Design a protein around this nucleic acid. Structure first.
Lengths: 157, 50
RNA sequence: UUAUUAAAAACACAGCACUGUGCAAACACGAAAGUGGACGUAUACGGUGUGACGCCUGCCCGGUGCCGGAAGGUUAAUUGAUGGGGUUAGCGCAAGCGAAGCUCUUGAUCGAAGCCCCGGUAAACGGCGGCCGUAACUAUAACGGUCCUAAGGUAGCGAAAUUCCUUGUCGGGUAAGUUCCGACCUGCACGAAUGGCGUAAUGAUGGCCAGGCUGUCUCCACCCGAGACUCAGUGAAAUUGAACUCGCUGUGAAGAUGCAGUGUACCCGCGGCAAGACGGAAAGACCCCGUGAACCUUUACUAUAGCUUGACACUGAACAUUGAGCCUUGAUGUGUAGGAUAGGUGGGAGGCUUUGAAGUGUGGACGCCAGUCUGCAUGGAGCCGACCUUGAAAUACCACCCUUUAAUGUUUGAUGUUCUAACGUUGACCCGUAAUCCGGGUUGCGGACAGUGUCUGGUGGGUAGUUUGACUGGGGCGGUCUCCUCCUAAAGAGUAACGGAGGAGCACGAAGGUUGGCUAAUCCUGGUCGGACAUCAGGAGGUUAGUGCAAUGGCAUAAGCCAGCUUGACUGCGAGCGUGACGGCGCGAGCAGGUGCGAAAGCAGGUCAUAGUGAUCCGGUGGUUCUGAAUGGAAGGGCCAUCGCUCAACGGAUAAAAGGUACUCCGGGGAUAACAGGCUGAUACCGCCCAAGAGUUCAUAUCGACGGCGGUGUUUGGCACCUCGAUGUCGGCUCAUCACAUCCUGGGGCUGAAGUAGGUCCCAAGGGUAUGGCUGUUCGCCAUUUAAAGUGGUACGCGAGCUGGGUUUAG
RNA sequence: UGUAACGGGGCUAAACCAUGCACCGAAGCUGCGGCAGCGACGCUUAUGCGUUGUUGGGUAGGGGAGCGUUCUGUAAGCCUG
RNA sequence: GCUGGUUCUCCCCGAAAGCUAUUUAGGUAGCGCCUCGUGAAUUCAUCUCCGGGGGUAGAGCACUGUUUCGGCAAGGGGGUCACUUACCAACCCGAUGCAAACUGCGAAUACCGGAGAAUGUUAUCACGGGAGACACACGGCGGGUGCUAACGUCCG
RNA sequence: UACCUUUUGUAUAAUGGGUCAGCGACUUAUAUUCUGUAGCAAGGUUAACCGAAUAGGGGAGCCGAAGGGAAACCGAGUCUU
RNA sequence: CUGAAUCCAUAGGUUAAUGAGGCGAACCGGGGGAACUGAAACAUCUAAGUACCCCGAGGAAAAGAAAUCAACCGAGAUUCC
RNA sequence: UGCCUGGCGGCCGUAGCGCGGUGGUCCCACCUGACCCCAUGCCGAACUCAGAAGUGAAACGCCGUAGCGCCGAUGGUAGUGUGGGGUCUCCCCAUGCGAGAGUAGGGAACUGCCAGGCA
């Protein structure tokens, strides 16, 4: 509706692209980014400062022509700034004590709602979780419980 | 924007390629097009249209 | 307290509250020593908020700040396993491959803080609002139904800060009170330590009233002294282009002593008043500009001081616990019906076993004792699987294996305990030494901690350097900058405006080329579901239809429509022309090669055309032995094609930048606003004409609807001209002047004028044309008189006459 | 502010309409004299004339040709109590 | 990148306040324009004739819009339990207008080129040196905006 | 109806000067382009330095007589194919 | 020559001989070190290791004898034009 | 070389549209027989065939018809270049160029080459 209205909208997308290049390689693969865009990211930091502007012009160019919300939404989870991400972790730890203290009454909800949960391994993990807590041993396996639930949270496959 | 720029490489062993644009969304099939190649001084097929 | 315009309601104040601080205290001054705090010790010191006293300080942890907790995700320095490249001893009669060493590069594992996350913290920063409908305007202002908020104002005090009409209107104060005082209400915002209510006393504090008092005033008069005046003596000043320096009308860079016309005026002093010389004193302080400067702000940029985490060194000796990878070593997987502690991916109706078995027992051991594995011999010849059921069928076996975990060896972390010999000691004691410095020695206490040095992660307007482009708009924000179409555009081309209409940042491998073929809108008749199209049979129309999209110009040889083949949307070019200052852009016959179409003549270097775009620098890829800082390579560089811009500020100042300054400054500008002055009459005021209608008959005796023509123009406005090296306001006092569109007096006309009293119009400017409360007032209201208490110009007169009440820089 | 809507006096034509003949009227033109630039022919050649016609307002600006002062060589020359 | 001043004389020539671009709009670079120097063709200007395309003035309503009058009128509205009405009217026809974004028509001038007699100090073009300027105002003509309101703005 | 500056536009009441006398402003250096002038000429010319000290020596070096391409390279020819 | 903590020895104290203390215009080396300005702004940079401050001696100072260059031929200190 | 027909051109309505008449030995258009040569997103109307039995119905050519379309004067008028003037939002004067529309009128085509048939 206004040429300058598009301008600030496009410029806002430009600084978003400048945030992707300023993000580490290990966390770069987390976002569902296409290979064509991904390949342009690695060349962006290794190019000289003036070429970064051209690369920033590149990154903005084919990022506007496609959908942006899933990329922005996925980036928000990694930054842990989207509201649904932090509450998801709240319920993820809310089912820990619901499961680590009983071990039988909490598995029903997980299997009924999530069909990719390996109940063969989950029961054994709770067996170790009960053993370490009862024997007042350091929680060397409690961390792995959260990783498995977190991994299955976003379709581990 | 929606269009994706593509490169057409000669089916022969030469590395000479041509530049063009095709909409992948509507035409995802690879092109079967032949065009003149100066290095071989003949007409050669071009493929691998992204 | 603002020396030298603000003495206050501002600051401070004892008190109150919160927070930080255990002594080598926090903090500050200082690269550090050291000092202050304090030679004090939580009843002490520092910081912050409020500010006697009395009643009290209600709700909310959402964001920021603070504390604690850490479960988890992200995260640098640090260390160097793979992968690739270069070089070559050699292997190759060569193309090539390639041992070791060295080198360059991607970078697995270790990696904390920090960020988030949780609970508190509001006498921390802060917040306490809506939408629908009810009364209550009861003695005190509190009740329902909802939002996406964490929460909707407790008491206190109401005329408050939005809200308006009849200054809000009643009463005091006054004859008359836009100020003052308690109150009606249609009022609830503030608002409870950025404190709320009341508060005696206090104050050169704001406003109002009353009593005595007076030249403050009607209305000034006289007198006493110092100037002002004359004489004698001494003797400045700012300013000054030159002057032999009049009034009036008009012109003129627009307010004329100097111009044009005309009138007046003997020459020259002195004492005065100040209307003018856009007077004098300052290169305005009011507005604009500068790719000017300086301060301030931040979730603007790049940085940093400082704070903080980790690694490395100072920095050590004895251990104990234990987290992580790696090598086999055997088990290990209880949702359910089910012989029953079923792991996923393929083969699978059999492998194994007298190189001695089903099934009975202990030992060790897994272990949710529900169950299972196993050395041993006893034992002396054997076990399954679709079986029906399970989502899924096997300890019938053969493998990649995942998780949990058992026991050695390897590597590296983390935690805890002991000690002293590093290091610290603003602990004691002794000496230099008749010394609260310092050093040396003993001992005690910590102790490889703290702290320090380099790098690194985080915080970091506390500090430093900058940016915030041009066009005009306003309480805060926005829009435009490139290209294309028609008109404006005045018949070559081109031609601007805040001139009127718009579109583009694509798309098409067919929607291009060739060849062949065909020609619609709209309407008539007929025709079935079927209607205003379904497709049509017959007809006037040869394009008013269509031409991917906005518009225009074209399109029948069709460029419009359909089908076959198709890549000429090709490579190197390209004489020549046009457009622009140029970069650039467009057309382009024709040549060489290889192609597609049709038989051939020929067409095809994209789309009917005009917008669909980006020059250079610097990056990726391929080729080029083009070059290769001793030789051969290599690295690197060059050339060509190629993808590489919201470089959109689109001829593209940085790869990297937002705002304010009434605390501002500097250099310029009437290159640019406001008030006034001369154009102007959109709106509105004044006059006249046209005259249907209402008017006892009777249009202009008196109005008069729908319209038109003129004039100051004092409201509401816009245009070029400026005094920014200065054009001082609003109002009041003194002073007045001019025109009459006359308020009175004067002379009349008409009258629906009996007289007085009246109403309208004409002539007439000689004179006169008010006193007080309110508010700074102009104006206006009110009180009370007369003949009235006139209308306008005087730059809406008058500060080189006064006033500073409004406007009023600095608090 | 003062006649102020012919510049004034003033004009019944000294206003207006149509014609004719004259005059005044600028630095315009012509006459005389003088200077300078510009081409060309003939006198002839470092060049001026019998000439020839023409040109000669001018800011920013450009081109050309000169005057004046100090000092140096000229200059132990010259003027000079 | 601003303001101010830039000092002796003579002669000759002598424009602009425009275009493009500019973190540019009071500055700057190229061009437009000026001066000097070199070279070059009847080079260029004036006029006559010839060969040219307009869509401007004007005019018109075939095409694109607006709109009036009269005639024929499909149909819409009500009533009568096929008829009618003091309601409205599509379309066509004849006439009348207007239009920058309409032209079945269409000038004068302007512009391009060729030929020619005469005149014009080559006044024409190419290159080189040096500039200045890029704030224009008014009047006439044809326009946009404004009320053809303006000592109004922007155009040729 | 003065001068200077500013501007389209000034005596303008837009700026500056009270007067006189003196002082006061496009210079200098190093490179680069063009013109005039002088020498030499397919050659021109020396720096530093020595020095009989502006002489002479000194040809170190620079420019040009051949250019084309980025370059290897080619050559009165050169780059693209 | 004396001389503690601590026996030896030290730290320290006294006496004696030698050199310096400060000033100075420029030059040298070193230790610190900006901005105005240019890029038409500005952060890389230039400005510039300049101005400025301090230290040491000098008449000069610094540097001075190759772990230097060059390229398969080769020069054999440093310094300056 | 005289008449008729057909093809390829000159010019593009004085070149056409409409109405009536005329033509089949010859030149033209419908109409017949349909294994094939040419190929479909759908048959031999309409484009490709091996045949002359019929007809000039439609079309085409020719002639007349001025109903329409079209061309088009002369004069007049609007407009305009140049210079001057006016009571200057617009006009006039001297001269030059000269509209559109309308009227009279014209107009039922002309022409080149070749082939065939009748004299």
């Amino acid at each position: 509706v206004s040429k300058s209205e598009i301008k600030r909208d496009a410029e806002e997308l430009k600084r978003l692209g400048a945030e992707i290049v300023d993000l580490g390689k290990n966390a770069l693969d987390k976002i569902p980014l296409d290979a064509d865009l991904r390949a342009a990211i690695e060349l962006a930091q290794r190019i000289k400062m003036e070429g970064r502007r051209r690369q920033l012009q590149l990154i903005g160019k084919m990022l506007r022509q496609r959908d942006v919300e899933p990329i922005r939404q996925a980036l928000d989870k990694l930054k842990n700034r989207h509201n649904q991400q932090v509450v998801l972790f709240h319920k993820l730890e809310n089912l820990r004590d619901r499961l680590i203290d009983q071990g039988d009454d909490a598995i029903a909800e997980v299997l009924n709602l999530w069909p990719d949960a390996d109940r063969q391994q989950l029961r054994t993990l709770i067996r170790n979780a009960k053993k370490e807590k009862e024997g007042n041993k350091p929680p060397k396996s409690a961390r792995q419980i959260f990783q498995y639930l977190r991994e299955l949270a976003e379709n581990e496959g | 924007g929606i269009r994706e720029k593509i490169k057409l490489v000669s089916s022969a062993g030469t590395g000479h390629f041509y530049t063009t644009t095709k909409n992948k969304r509507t035409k995802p099939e690879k092109l079967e097009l032949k065009k003149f190649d100066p290095v071989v001084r003949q007409h050669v097929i071009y493929k691998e249209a992204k």
